[PDB]
Amino acid sequence: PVLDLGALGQDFAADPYPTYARLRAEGPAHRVRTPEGDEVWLVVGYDRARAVLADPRFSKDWRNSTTPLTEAEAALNHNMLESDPPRHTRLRKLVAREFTMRRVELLRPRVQEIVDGLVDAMLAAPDGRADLMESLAWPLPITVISELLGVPEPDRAAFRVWTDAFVFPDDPAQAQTAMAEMSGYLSRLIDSKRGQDGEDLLSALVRTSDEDGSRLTSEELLGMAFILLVAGHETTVNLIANGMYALLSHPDQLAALRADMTLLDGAVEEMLRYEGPVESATYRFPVEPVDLDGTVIPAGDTVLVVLADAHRTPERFPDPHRFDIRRDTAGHLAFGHGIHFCIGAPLARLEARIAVRALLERCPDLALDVSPGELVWYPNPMIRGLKALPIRWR
Ligand code: HEM
Ligand SMILES: C[As](C)(=O)[O-]
């Protein structure tokens, strides 16, 4: 049959893992209906999930999908995430050097500065309470990626409104309106860099496209700007929030990290394994019918790799539901796997490591200001993210 995820209510949004684990027990592939009404396939189980992410039979070119793209969706579709070789190879080569570890390490001073200033403005609240989402989890990633690509400061507020319509559309028409508004603005921002001799990443991409349209088309230029700004911000925002929630709702681990701050990098890794921002990888389409343990997914269907279930598979991560910052986290799929492995992983780790360190080093007696049952999770089956994260200190 077809399992409707919308009928499971907020209980699925708050804790989807028992539902995924129930499906993994009976097989790897399952037809489900998303809470928004889409019939997709769910791929569960760590071994199957890791394999499907790197399987060329599961394509990312929407030309291989039977699902139609709206005009607004198609306008931002020409990006590396929604591509197979050789288009994916060509597009990622354009910006790969900008996101290496050695190049991202050069941003560490500025990242620390952005974090230090946001922590200051948070600690200036008189009642000693704040929403960590609004005060640090959102401002930090959007500021870093905006300075890298050259988005003016007055333009960054509308990006939260737009991605708020992506992750949680009050009505599907609002997400479409946000996509057209973003597509129009990005085209205006691209045009504004032309001939201005800017040295930001978008200015370099505009010049690259103007010099040789075959290396980077104007649609691919728009798509590149789109994917770099959206895929960077949203996931990093939720990683900071999901991870601080994990530390504050597991006080023994917070104390262990406070005792030995060399476990910081391992704690962030387990943050990604325990409550990674990506619940399911982006849409994949089989170019031919694929047989998964007697279950045959037809060509062109929408396949969702449930990364969250892969991280709760006990044969790969023993005691999966335990948040252990000393755990062996090697081989998690939080950043994906294969040719589409997150190009922003070094930058995201740098942002998360500095943010978590600054919060703990500056604010002892930091605490969650609500009960874990009071937190609200977004009903998006693709995103594991909170509406807010109330905290208090001193
Ligand atoms: C919390 C941190 C992050 C997480 C968990 C994350 C997660 C992911 C995942 C799972 C994928 C592969 C999706 C798929 O296979 O369906 C991906 C791809 C991608 N991510 Fe991220 N990401 C993060 C940070 C970033 C940042 C900061 C940037 C931008 C600077 C970024 C840009 C991209 C791009 C461009 C791709 C497409 C790569 C390609 O197709 O080769 N990500 N990310
Ligand atoms: C800074 As603009 C894209 O509104 O010209």
| CATH code of the domain containing 144 | 1.10.630.10
Identify whether the C-beta of residue 349 lies closer than 8 Å to the C-beta of residue 342: no
* Total of domains in the chain: 1
Which residues are near ligand 2 (CB < 6 Å)? 152, 155, 185, 188-189, 192
Distance from residue 270's CA to the centre of ligand 2 (Å):
40
Q: Is the peptide bond before 141 cis (omega within 30 degrees of 0)?
A: no
Long-range Cβ contact pairs of 168-176 (< 8 A, separation 24 or more)? 168/378, 168/379, 168/380, 169/36, 172/36, 176/70, 176/72, 176/73
Nearest to 239 by CA among 247, 250, 249: 247
Which ligand gives the minimal distance to the CA of 192?
2
Q: How was this structure determined?
A: X-ray
Which ligand gives the minimal distance to the CA of 188?
2
Please state the atom number of ligand 2 nearest to the C-alpha of residue 192.
Answer: 5
Report the distance separating Cα 386 and Cα 275, nearest Å: 11
Q: How far apart are the first and last CA of the chain?
A: 53
Report the distance separating Cα 194 and Cα 304, nearest Å: 39
Nearest to 41 by CA among 342, 299, 235, 215: 299
Q: Which residue range(s) make up the domain with 13?
A: 3-392
What letter represents residue 15's amino acid? D
Report the distance separating Cα 175 and Cα 184, nearest Å: 14
Q: Residue 149: CB within 6 Å of ligand 1?
A: no
Closest C-alpha to ligand 2, atom 2: 189
